[PDB]
Design an enzyme around this catalytic site. Structure first.
Site, PDB file in Angstrom:
ATOM      1  N   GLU E 173       0.824  -1.204   0.000  1.00 19.36           N
ATOM      2  CA  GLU E 173       0.000   0.000   0.000  1.00 19.36           C
ATOM      3  C   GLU E 173       0.864   1.262   0.000  1.00 19.36           C
ATOM      4  O   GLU E 173       0.809   2.089   0.910  1.00 19.36           O
ATOM      5  CB  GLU E 173      -0.970  -0.008   1.183  1.00 19.36           C
ATOM      6  CG  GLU E 173      -2.178  -0.901   0.987  1.00 19.36           C
ATOM      7  CD  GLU E 173      -3.303  -0.216   0.241  1.00 19.36           C
ATOM      8  OE1 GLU E 173      -4.474  -0.423   0.615  1.00 19.36           O
ATOM      9  OE2 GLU E 173      -3.021   0.529  -0.720  1.00 19.36           O
ATOM     10  N   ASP E 174       1.686   1.378  -1.040  1.00 20.16           N
ATOM     11  CA  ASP E 174       2.460   2.563  -1.398  1.00 20.16           C
ATOM     12  C   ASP E 174       3.642   2.834  -0.478  1.00 20.16           C
ATOM     13  O   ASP E 174       4.415   3.751  -0.760  1.00 20.16           O
ATOM     14  CB  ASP E 174       1.592   3.826  -1.452  1.00 20.16           C
ATOM     15  CG  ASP E 174       0.514   3.741  -2.504  1.00 20.16           C
ATOM     16  OD1 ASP E 174       0.785   3.179  -3.585  1.00 20.16           O
ATOM     17  OD2 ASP E 174      -0.606   4.234  -2.255  1.00 20.16           O
ATOM     18  N   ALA E 175       3.816   2.082   0.601  1.00 17.82           N
ATOM     19  CA  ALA E 175       4.994   2.272   1.429  1.00 17.82           C
ATOM     20  C   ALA E 175       6.233   1.766   0.700  1.00 17.82           C
ATOM     21  O   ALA E 175       6.152   0.969  -0.235  1.00 17.82           O
ATOM     22  CB  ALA E 175       4.835   1.552   2.764  1.00 17.82           C
TER      23      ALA E 175
ATOM     24  N   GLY I  58       4.845   7.921  -1.417  1.00 10.98           N
ATOM     25  CA  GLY I  58       4.788   6.961  -0.335  1.00 10.98           C
ATOM     26  C   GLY I  58       5.693   7.321   0.821  1.00 10.98           C
ATOM     27  O   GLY I  58       6.644   8.086   0.656  1.00 10.98           O
ATOM     28  N   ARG I  90      -1.818   1.815 -11.727  1.00 11.38           N
ATOM     29  CA  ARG I  90      -1.509   3.200 -12.040  1.00 11.38           C
ATOM     30  C   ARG I  90      -1.075   3.404 -13.482  1.00 11.38           C
ATOM     31  O   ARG I  90      -1.216   4.516 -14.001  1.00 11.38           O
ATOM     32  CB  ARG I  90      -0.413   3.723 -11.106  1.00 11.38           C
ATOM     33  CG  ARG I  90      -0.927   4.225  -9.770  1.00 11.38           C
ATOM     34  CD  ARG I  90      -1.341   3.076  -8.875  1.00 11.38           C
ATOM     35  NE  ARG I  90      -1.907   3.531  -7.613  1.00 11.38           N
ATOM     36  CZ  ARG I  90      -1.222   3.637  -6.483  1.00 11.38           C
ATOM     37  NH1 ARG I  90       0.066   3.344  -6.427  1.00 11.38           N
ATOM     38  NH2 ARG I  90      -1.846   4.044  -5.383  1.00 11.38           N
TER      39      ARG I  90
END
Ligand SMILES: [Mg+2]
Ligand SMILES: [Zn+2]
Ligand SMILES: [Zn+2]
Ligand SMILES: [Zn+2]
Ligand SMILES: [Zn+2]
Lengths: 388, 76, 51, 55, 203, 901, 50, 65, 221
Positions: E173-175, I58, I90
């Site tokens: 999740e984008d980390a 992020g 994306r």
């Protein structure tokens, strides 16, 4: 085990279950018994398990169902699309979808943006395209513009020759002499020198361009055959029978049209349903509308919340908007209404009427500083003092 | 010839007698003013002989439980 | 291309506006009324003239 | 009879408050625990003096 | 409607184009050579009628050719550099035509909010708050516009050796997961300034 | 000894009540006095209560800050009409006889209206309608049915002037002004029985009391003097108005007792009436607003209440609550789903009060010895009497030896404490949940990844708030009612809402994929990492070439499931329905086939579990995904919540380990297509463009059939859009066909872990038509979108159809069209948030009072019955399987298998 | 010139310059704004124009 | 702003090779050959020398005392 | 005074650093004026926000020691690991192309032009990378840091420009010892918790005790 024995055991043990539950249990128990040869012990165990599960599934008192329903309706709408689409289908009628449709239903606007009626057919006309087209012609609401292949509006010499297409005339079932006769029977103060496949009109010797333009547009969109306020009709074929979708809203008139099955006929406008069939029909129509709108977007919402919303809306015979115009604006709690208004006359009216605030809500209790009467705010506790 | 009760959207209606009306009122510890209301101009009321101050029993067709009873009172 | 005002740097953001002294026609959808409007600028005064 | 979860929550809260105020614990508990898990263990063992009154 | 419009006022947004006549653009090789050697300037090209400015109104009558090898007799103008239609921050993104538009918009925003040596004046400048990246680096893959604008002289960011891989579930999740030793050796290190003001106010 | 207000009934005060309720009869218009002392008989007396420091209240004897204040009354010389009741008084006068005062209505009409009112009591709108109808009927009447006397018309002049249009002996109509005494005399004669029809209650609101005879004076606390920066006692507007009222009242009284002419008495009466009206409401219609000493309208009683920031609408607000923190969040799957990681610095500030008892004395003693700097420490200690002290270092050594039962220690947060967790915007119920604290270094709120869906959170800078409940009742409520475990099943659709998201699905597929085997080292390591309690490996399945044992992934996964679970279904990977048909045939035929037979018929598209052993199928979204989590739902609804939590906490770690140590990636070659597929896509595009050009030519040469719903141009646009959409679908089908399952991106799309097939289509084969508001691109120059196209062109390429995928790269015109589409999407996203928020606010304001009674009924806040047996079946949507009350099919199958096994 | 608020009703005409880095400053010096209301969904005005 | 002493990734000392690389490249030699001569085979090290900026001269002129 | 009162200027409660520059001067009306600049060193830590140029943002979730990082047969140890799940949803192919381009530029010794439409085509970059002795797909064989074994798949690896945003956690975190709203109130009501609502909202020092008569209904004294 004879099926009568299963039915008797179901009635004996699962008497608490709702009717649909016991009926479905009987059906599937019959199927599984004929497939696997169950004995009575298994049937008794199954029914006991069903009863225990149903008892576990009951809602407990004090549950705040209203807030949960409001949240479970509002939350999916944020993920739902926000109009700004133009779905251009061929055998379909444009209808407002998504958030605007939900808002219109919830606020109970008097007239929907895109009224639309679903008309079913009786047995005679159900299983044929041609009879469906005949009933359509009965309900088409045909207009001269649709009949005409093209229109020529030449104001330079005060005439108006509109070109009528033969195929549209045949589809509508009207002939040139018939339509001209109807027009003159309606437009008495006019002269129609119809020739060939073209209509010719004159506005009883008009003088100015605007007068003849208005007269020509008056004839152009004038209705010839069909019930009032009905546009294009798209006869489709769903399942095995033919169903007539239709624009407009004349729900009470269409029920008298021959060949129309009135039992299954529905309409988009909930207010018309309330006027014609009653208030229970309005509630059911609201439920179905919200369910369909939720389903087309792919979202899933339990039927119970929609049922609660619909029941709350039609609480006093007449469908009212759920907002501050018809529901919030008539809150009994003068304290709750107080922090929603701009004047103080409501306080004086309440004092005059001797209104009693029952403090049964949430805002009033929160303002006072007392436990809200929901959930843990409902229970009372007692204890026997002698303790080990 | 067409009656509103044949429509799928219209559940069956019935008029309660005095004994069942009072039994129902006592069952929920309520008064007549606390029930949902149906106007006297409703087509279902006209199809019946209902008069104001009377309690109408409605037998809904529920998607969840099949049969379910709802009650309304008649007002002006 | 910026100013110093009381020791802080200020920048004026250009504002996109309708061209003055030009008539633009348009149609409403509730009064079925064709209208045309024009803004006239005269020494810093904007006048709305509509026919 | 079955305890609704609201009733259980209120019972636990009242019992924990009483234990904190100075009421004795009806069962032996491991050392160094707050009143809350003491009340939770008391409920789990089924030893609860408090009862609910329903209309 | 047989109307002729002439505009000579302020505030019109115009773009330059190469005049094309009879299927032959006016710009020639010798003009490019002269500009390369510095003997000719942009204003000179404007005054000789090689390049024309068009506003939104005059462009109505135009028929522009995207590329120099697409010009025909019907065309009246030739696009100068199609890559210049983007703004300044949007030109920082390399290969912008291989991305979805929302991601390009987000990239422009982040480029506007990134740390780096903005101005050499920072040591003596007085600002409410500012940042300084310790070791800025030129982007390895960079548009040629960035050098012309001057972004290379004041870069903002560093080049990372990145491997696309799931690791311990700590980057779901984008980390992202960063190497410790690289941080110790100076990667992504920065400094934060703040200025306080006190005035001896006479009453 | 502490009771709760159960109801509040509103009414109209009577003069006797005001007289006896009050204490001091205010008569002298006295201010705070020069020495700031309350003057006797003044507006701020000592019987009114004291707000000034250093003196005692006369009535209650309380010092300022503890005296609640007391009421005083003013004896008016003449009756004054209340401004609020003016319209009510005027309506009443038009409905009652001038002589008898009874309602001008027939007895039968009275009976009918009484019955209707009794029926429609609760409905406020209908009650008002009935009242208005009766008022109109009575006002239209002219002769009293009881007396027969004429009733001269009554005319109302705003704000408080009433005129009786009487006819002289010559028939001329002249306006006779009704003095308030006349109105009172008229109102007194109205009998009690007529009040309900008139819209009144003859026990709490009598018409005579609407006209004021005694004016109560608010206590000093209610009208405090806020003073000024200069020390001037800035008075209250109410105080000034009361001073003026007292002055005018005394003046009117002294002129009355002096035999003054009628004109001056009338003048002072009207001055008193105007002052009273402006004191009650300074913004009443037809009333000139009284100016302050500075020339501004004075804030009066009406303005003090109808304020958005006042008592109404102002008390409800959102402010900085105590014991809260806010910081960014970072992920970690090493903690249980019902746990949260808290930074040390936050834990050292958000103290929780704990009362010391016998079983926790030593722990609190150590904590208070640690001081407010060591992490397991305390910040404040409260003695049994009530004083609070800071531990600090001076008295750190003490306050521990003298700490015994009855004290209170505000210790730091420690592991196991309960804490709320919130994410704004808070949409549904699951946006606030209770977690268990686990203090870890650094500064971030660590959150398990399976809990992301209900919070709708992504780790890209999102921030979260946590609140620490203080009292024991709040802590118990949070622990029992609000824990993460109890909220696995969503109340909305009755399915799970907590489950795997991205790696928990793909890694599960990798583990259970057909033909996947693991060595002994990996098996032991992953089992230990997942926390599964095991002490002997099962029998190896298949041996490696060189002799090492191997274990299939299915058995390893089966080590997690319970011992008696049994289920079968079809997942999303089913692409050859014949094999699923064969497996279903066998299963239905036997209900417990020998596991050997299933092995030959195994197929990863058909999940089948027998007695906790995974025999066929592969893990995908339908196993324990965000929705349709068949296995997770089964565990929740059959083995309790705790078992479900353990299962989730084990499967998450197992799947993460296998995906981490097995390798999972994606490169630029993941969307590389063979040459034949590229040629197929190119020819599809060319054919579609040719058909579009044919349509355009047919339209140009007049050969077109306009369907009734659309004109020629609209029909043309519809046909073009349909053709282009079908072409894009065909290209996507080709691209999907030529992309193998071994591709990682294809795995991610197919299992449902992340992305859609459309994403692969756009990235590899074709991007497709770009539209704005459901229409083809049209907003640009006159007749053309861009300037590089010939005007009046309707071809596909010239109106937003882009033929390049992301891999190939877009030409500038295609780039601009894609920018248009993206901008439209962003705008829609921006606006839909506000629209949905408004709708939700309306719904909540409408429905937030309904609740389930103890007999199963749902009742409106005003007492109306809304629904008997909530839901028409009494089943909570959470407890419902997927909408059905009881899933009798599963019950039958489960019971049959359990008892026939 | 400080605090914006040009006479004539316009507000926010002058803004504080952004000095976060090179790109932010150069972009803020090249900004173009519209006087329409932020709240109303100006669908026609928000979308990109050819 | 000045050249980093060590490569960020692998820690190899490359601080002293920057000026040599710059001077050799300015002379017209092949950058790849120069980098190979200096002894940087992993591209992690080559990136540090290739993408560096010497801003110390630009920021040296403003003094603060 | 409005004796003398302190009006000294102090740093913000949640900040730290070292004083860097102090200047003294006079305002426009002769009054003295001083400015103090405070600098703070901010090494990256958990929660700091990073974003690439292709709109991929992020926060860092873990700082892992070097020996636990997987390495490559060529000896490359990645400085940053991103999740593969972020790419397909994306559709930022430009990121992968830039990774390949950065690898090629580092190996070849000259920067790579990425100027929009007239940039270097990606197929040329792939061909150059293949010629230089690497796989044309940009994938390499890597070994696991912990176990030391060989990863089964070939991992895409390259060089990508990354910029650090100023949304850093050291400025966001703050806690109050001695935010809420209406949606939170509705949520708490929906959970059924009432004493929690009383505790969180009313709190203390704003509620009082009032004697009430049970006969008439007036405030007793
Ligand atoms: Mg986010
Ligand atoms: Zn007192
Ligand atoms: Zn009378
Ligand atoms: Zn290196
Ligand atoms: Zn009393």
């Amino acid at each position: 085990v004879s099926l009568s024995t299963i039915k008797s055991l179901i009635e004996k043990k699962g008497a608490n279950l709702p009717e649909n539950v016991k009926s479905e249990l009987y059906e599937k128990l019959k199927k599984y018994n004929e497939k696997y040869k169950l004995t009575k012990a298994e049937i008794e165990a199954i029914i006991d398990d069903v009863v225990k599960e149903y008892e576990r599934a009951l809602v407990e008192p004090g549950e705040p169902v209203g807030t949960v329903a409001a949240q479970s309706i509002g939350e999916p709408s944020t993920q739902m699309t926000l109009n700004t689409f133009h779905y251009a289908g061929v055998a379909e009628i444009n209808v407002t979808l998504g958030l605007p449709r939900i808002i219109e239903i919830v606020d109970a606007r008097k007239n929907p943006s895109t009224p639309m009626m679903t008309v079913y057919l009786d047995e005679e006309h159900r299983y044929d395209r041609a009879k469906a087209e005949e009933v359509a012609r009965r309900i088409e609401g045909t207009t001269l513009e649709n009949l005409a292949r093209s229109t020529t509006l030449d104001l330079i010499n005060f005439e108006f020759i509109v070109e009528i297409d033969p195929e549209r005339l045949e589809r509508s079932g009207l002939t040139m002499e018939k339509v001209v006769k109807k027009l003159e029977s309606s437009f008495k103060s006019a002269e129609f020198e119809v020739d060939g496949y073209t209509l010719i009109v004159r506005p009883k010797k008009a003088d100015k361009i605007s007068d003849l333009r208005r007269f020509a547009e008056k004839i152009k969109k004038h209705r010839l055959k069909g019930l009032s306020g009905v546009g294009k009709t798209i006869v489709r074929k769903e399942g095995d029978e033919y169903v007539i979708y239709t624009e407009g809203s004349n729900f009470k008139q269409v029920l008298k049209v021959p060949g129309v099955d009135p039992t299954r006929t529905r309409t988009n406008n909930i207010h018309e349903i309330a006027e014609v069939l009653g208030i229970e029909a309005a509630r059911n129509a609201i439920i179905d509308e919200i369910v369909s709108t939720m389903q087309e977007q792919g979202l899933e919402v339990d039927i119970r919340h929609i049922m609660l919303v619909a029941d709350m809306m039609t609480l006093d015979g007449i469908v009212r908007p759920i907002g501050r115009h018809g529901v919030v604006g008539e809150k009994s709690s003068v304290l709750a209404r107080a922090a929603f208004e701009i004047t103080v006359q409501h306080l004086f009216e309440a004092a005059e009427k001797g209104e009693v605030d029952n403090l049964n809500g949430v805002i009033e209790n929160v303002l006072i500083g007392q436990p809200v009467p929901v959930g843990t705010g409902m229970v009372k506790l007692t204890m026997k003092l002698p303790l080990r | 010839e067409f009656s509103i009760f044949d429509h799928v959207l219209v559940p069956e209606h019935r008029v309660l007698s005095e004994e069942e009306k009072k039994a129902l009122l006592e069952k929920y510890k309520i008064t007549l003013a606390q029930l949902p209301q149906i106007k006297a101009s409703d087509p279902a009321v006209k199809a019946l002989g209902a008069k104001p101050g009377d309690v109408i029993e409605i037998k809904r067709k529920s998607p969840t439980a099949g049969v379910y009873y709802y009650y309304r009172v008649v007002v002006e | 291309g910026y100013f110093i005002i009381n020791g802080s740097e200020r920048v004026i953001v250009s504002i996109e506006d309708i061209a003055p002294n030009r008539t633009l026609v348009e149609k409403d959808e509730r009064q079925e009324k064709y209208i045309a409007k024009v803004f006239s600028y005269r020494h810093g005064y904007r006048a709305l003239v509509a026919v | 009879f079955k305890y609704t979860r609201f009733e259980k929550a209120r019972i636990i809260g009242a019992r924990a408050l009483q234990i904190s105020m100075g009421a004795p614990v009806l069962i032996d508990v491991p050392p160094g625990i707050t009143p809350l898990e003491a009340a939770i263990l008391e409920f789990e063992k089924g030893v609860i003096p408090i009862t609910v009154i329903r209309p | 409607v047989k109307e002729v419009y002439v505009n000579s006022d302020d505030g019109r947004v115009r773009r330059p184009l190469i005049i094309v006549e009879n299927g032959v653009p006016k710009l020639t090789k010798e003009h490019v050579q002269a500009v390369k050697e510095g003997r000719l300037k942009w204003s000179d090209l404007i005054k000789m009628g090689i390049i024309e400015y068009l506003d939104a109104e005059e462009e109505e009558n135009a028929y522009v050719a995207m590329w120099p090898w697409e010009v025909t007799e019907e065309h009246t103008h030739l696009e100068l550099m199609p890559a210049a239609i983007l703004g300044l921050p949007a030109s920082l993104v390399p290969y912008p035509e291989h991305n979805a538009a929302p991601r390009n918009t987000y990239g422009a925003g982040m480029a506007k909010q990134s740390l780096g040596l903005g101005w050499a004046n920072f040591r003596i400048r007085v600002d409410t708050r500012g940042h300084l990246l310790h070791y800025p680096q030129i982007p390895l893959v960079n548009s040629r516009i960035m050098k012309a604008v001057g972004y290379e002289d004041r870069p903002a960011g560093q080049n990372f050796v990145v491997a696309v891989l799931a690791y311990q579930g700590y980057n779901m999740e984008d980390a992202i997961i960063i190497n410790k030793a690289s941080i110790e050796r100076g990667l992504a290190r920065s400094t934060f300034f703040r200025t306080y003001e006190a005035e001896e106010k006479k009453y | 000894m502490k009771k709760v207000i159960g109801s509040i009934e509103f009414g109209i005060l009577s003069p006797q009540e005001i007289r006896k309720m009050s204490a001091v009869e205010v008569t002298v218009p006295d201010t705070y006095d020069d020495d700031g002392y309350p003057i006797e008989g003044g507006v701020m007396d000592k019987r009114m209560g004291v707000i000034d420091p250093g003196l005692r209240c006369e009535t209650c004897g309380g010092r300022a800050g503890e005296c609640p204040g007391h009421f005083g009354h003013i004896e008016l010389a003449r009756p004054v009409i209340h401004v609020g009741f003016a319209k009510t008084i005027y309506r009443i006068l038009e409905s009652t006889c001038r002589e008898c005062g009874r309602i001008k209505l027939t007895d039968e009409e009275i009976e009918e209206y009484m019955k209707k009112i009794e029926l429609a009591r609760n409905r406020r709108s209908e009650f008002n309608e009935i009242i208005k109808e009766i008022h109109k009927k009575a006002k239209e009447r002219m002769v009293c049915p009881h007396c027969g006397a004429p009733q001269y018309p009554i005319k109302f002049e705003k704000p408080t002037i009433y005129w009786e249009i009487r006819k002289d002996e010559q028939g001329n109509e002249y306006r006779h002004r009704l003095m308030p005494t006349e109105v009172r005399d008229w109102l007194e004669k109205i009998p009690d029985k007529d009040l309900p029809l008139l819209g009144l209650d003859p026990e709490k609101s009598r018409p005579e009391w609407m006209v004021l005879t005694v004016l109560p004076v608010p206590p000093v606390t209610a009208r405090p003097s806020i003073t000024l920066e200069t020390g001037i006692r800035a008075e209250d507007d109410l105080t000034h108005k009361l001073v003026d009222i007292i002055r005018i009242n005394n003046r009117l009284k002294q002129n009355i007792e002096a035999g003054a002419p009628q004109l001056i008495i009338e003048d002072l009466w009207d001055l008193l009436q105007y002052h009273v009206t402006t004191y009650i409401n300074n913004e009443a219609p037809g009333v000139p607003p009284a100016k302050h000493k500075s020339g501004r309208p004075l804030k009066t009683l009406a303005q003090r209440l109808k304020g958005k920031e006042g008592r109404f609408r102002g008390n409800l607000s959102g402010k900085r609550v105590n014991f809260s923190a806010r910081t960014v969040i970072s992920p970690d799957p090493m903690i249980s789903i019902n746990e949260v990681g808290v930074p040390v610095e936050v834990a050292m500030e958000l103290t929780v009060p704990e009362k010391v008892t016998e079983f926790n004395i030593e722990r609190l003693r150590k904590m208070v010895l640690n001081g407010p700097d060591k992490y397991p420490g305390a910040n404040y200690v409260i003695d049994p009497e009530g004083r609070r002290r800071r531990i600090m270092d001076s008295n750190k050594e003490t306050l521990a030896n003298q700490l015994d039962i009855g004290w209170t220690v505000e210790r730091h947060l420690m592991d196991g404490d309960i804490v709320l967790f919130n994410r704004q915007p808070s949409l549904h119920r699951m946006s606030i949940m209770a977690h268990r604290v686990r203090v870890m270094p650094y500064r971030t709120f660590r959150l398990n990844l399976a809990v992301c869906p209900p919070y709708n959170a992504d780790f890209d800078g999102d921030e979260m708030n946590l609140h620490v409940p203080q009292t024991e009742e709040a802590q118990a409520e949070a622990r029992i009612l609000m824990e993460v475990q109890n909220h696995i099943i969503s109340p909305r659709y009755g399915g799970p809402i907590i489950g795997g998201i991205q790696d928990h699905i793909s890694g599960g597929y990798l583990l259970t994929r057909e033909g996947a085997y693991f060595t002994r080292d990996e098996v032991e390591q992953m089992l230990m990492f997942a926390g599964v309690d095991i002490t002997e490996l099962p029998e190896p399945d298949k041996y490696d070439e060189n002799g090492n044992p191997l274990w299939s992934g299915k058995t390893i996964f089966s080590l997690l499931l319970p011992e008696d679970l049994t289920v079968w279904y079809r997942n999303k990977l089913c692409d050859e329905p014949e094999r699923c048909e064969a497996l279903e045939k066998l299963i239905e035929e036997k209900l417990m086939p020998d596991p050997e037979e299933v092995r030959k018929l195994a197929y990863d598209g058909f999940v089948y579990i027998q007695n906790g052993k995974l025999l066929s199928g592969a893990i995908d979204k339908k196993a324990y995904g965000r929705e349709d989590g068949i296995i997770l739902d089964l565990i929740v609804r059959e083995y309790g919540v705790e078992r479900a939590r353990q299962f989730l906490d084990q499967v998450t770690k197992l799947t993460i380990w296998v995906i981490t140590h097995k390798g999972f990636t994606t490169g630029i070659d993941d969307e590389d297509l063979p040459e034949e597929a590229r040629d197929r896509i190119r020819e599809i595009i060319r054919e579609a463009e040719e058909r579009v050009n044919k349509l355009i030519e047919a339209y140009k040469r007049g050969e077109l059939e306009p369907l009734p719903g659309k004109s020629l141009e609209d029909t043309l646009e519809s046909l073009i859009m349909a053709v282009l959409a079908e072409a894009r679908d065909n290209a996507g089908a080709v691209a999907e066909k030529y992309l193998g399952m071994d591709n990682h991106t294809v795995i991610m799309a197919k299992t449902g872990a992340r992305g859609k097939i459309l994403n692969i289509t756009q990235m590899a084969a074709l991007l497709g038509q770009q539209s704005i508001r459901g229409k083809r691109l049209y907003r640009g120059f006159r007749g053309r979108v861009l300037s590089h196209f010939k005007p009046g062109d309707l071809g596909a390429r010239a109106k937003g159809f882009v033929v390049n995928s992301y891999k190939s790269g877009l030409t500038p015109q295609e780039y601009f069209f894609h920018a248009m589409g993206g901008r439209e999407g962003l705008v829609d996203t921006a606006v839909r948030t506000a629209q949905s928020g408004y709708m939700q606010r309306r719904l909540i304001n409408a429905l937030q009072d309904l609740k389930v009674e103890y007999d199963g009924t749902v009742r409106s806040p005003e007492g109306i019955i809304v629904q008997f047996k909530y839901g028409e079946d009494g089943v909570d949507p959470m407890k419902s399987w997927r909408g059905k009350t009881v899933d009798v099919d599963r019950i039958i199958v489960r019971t049959l298998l359990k008892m026939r096994g | 010139l400080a605090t914006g608020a040009w006479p004539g009703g316009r507000t926010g005409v002058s803004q504080l310059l952004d000095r976060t880095n090179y790109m932010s400053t150069l972009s803020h010096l090249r900004r173009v704004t519209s006087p329409l209301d932020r709240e109303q969904p100006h669908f026609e005005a928000r979308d990109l124009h050819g | 702003m000045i050249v980093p002493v060590r490569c960020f990734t692998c820690g190899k000392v490359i601080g002293d090779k920057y000026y040599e690389f710059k001077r050799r490249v300015e002379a017209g030699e092949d950058p790849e050959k120069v980098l190979d001569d200096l002894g940087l085979e992993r591209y992690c090290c080559r990136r540090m020398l290739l993408s560096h900026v010497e801003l110390i001269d630009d920021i040296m002129h403003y003094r603060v005392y | 005074p409005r004796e003398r009162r302190e009006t000294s200027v102090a740093v913000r409660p949640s900040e730290k650093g070292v004083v860097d520059k102090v200047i003294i001067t006079e305002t426009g009306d002769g009054t003295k004026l001083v400015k103090v600049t405070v600098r703070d060193l901010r090494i990256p830590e958990l929660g700091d926000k990073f974003a690439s140029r292709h709109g991929q943002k992020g926060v860092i979730g873990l700082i892992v020691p070097q020996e636990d990082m997987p390495w490559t047969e060529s000896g490359i140890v990645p400085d940053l690991i991103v999740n593969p799940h972020g790419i397909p949803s994306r559709m930022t192919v430009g990121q992968l192309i830039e990774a390949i381009g950065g690898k090629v530029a580092s190996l070849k010794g000259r920067r790579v032009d990425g100027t929009a439409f007239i940039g270097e085509p990606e197929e040329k970059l792939r061909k150059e990378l293949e010629e230089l002795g690497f796989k044309h797909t940009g994938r390499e064989i890597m070994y696991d840091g912990i176990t030391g074994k060989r990863l089964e798949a070939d991992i895409f690896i390259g060089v990508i420009y990354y910029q650090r945003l100023h949304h850093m956690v050291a400025d966001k975190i703050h806690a109050r010892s001695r935010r809420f709203g209406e949606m939170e109130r509705d949520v708490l009501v929906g959970h059924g918790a009432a004493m929690l609502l009383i505790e969180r909202l009313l709190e203390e020092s704003d509620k009082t005790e009032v004697w009430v008569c049970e006969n008439c209904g007036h405030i007793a004294l």
